[PDB]
Design a protein around this ligand. Sequence first.
Ligand code: HEM
Length: 154
Amino acid sequence: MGLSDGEWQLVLNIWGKVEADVAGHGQDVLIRLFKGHPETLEKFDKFKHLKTEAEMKASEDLKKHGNTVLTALGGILKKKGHHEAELKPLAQSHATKHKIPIKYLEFISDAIIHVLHSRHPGDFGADAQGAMNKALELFRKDIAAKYKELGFQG
Ligand code: HEM
């Protein structure tokens, strides 16, 4: 499931563009997720009134959470697969506290890739698309393994 040095470079190069506006990207990611898959929004009680993209875009609380999400994922990707320590706390909370079905991680992955297409069409070429998909697939695999280790079957 691993990535070559080349594939990681493609990943970290496009990620570098995300780093110019982590909160903006994070915001757009959660908007895509919540609009494409409303069942995910149901996990955030404090966002229940947010129904339209405009309402979501206007929420600084949602933007702040977007920042929190991509900051954590950024820490993980920069480790190039060597992300045990970063994944431990995240699997623990998401498996045992928030109880986020593993499927929803695939949805947020899709949403991340969508935002990258939206914001960086010049720089997010097909090689970088393939590599990002691989990187997110590794992330999902490793966390899904932790979920089961923790007894979370959702
Ligand atoms: C790339 C995947 C994800 C990353 C990196 C991520 C990261 C985080 C982080 C860092 C936090 C705060 C610390 C913590 O509680 O662990 C958090 C909280 C949370 N996450 Fe995630 N998350 C991801 C996916 C998801 C998805 C897909 C959902 C729901 C469909 C979700 C639901 C939540 C909820 C409900 C909280 C608590 C929010 C609050 O009460 O303020 N997460 N996430």
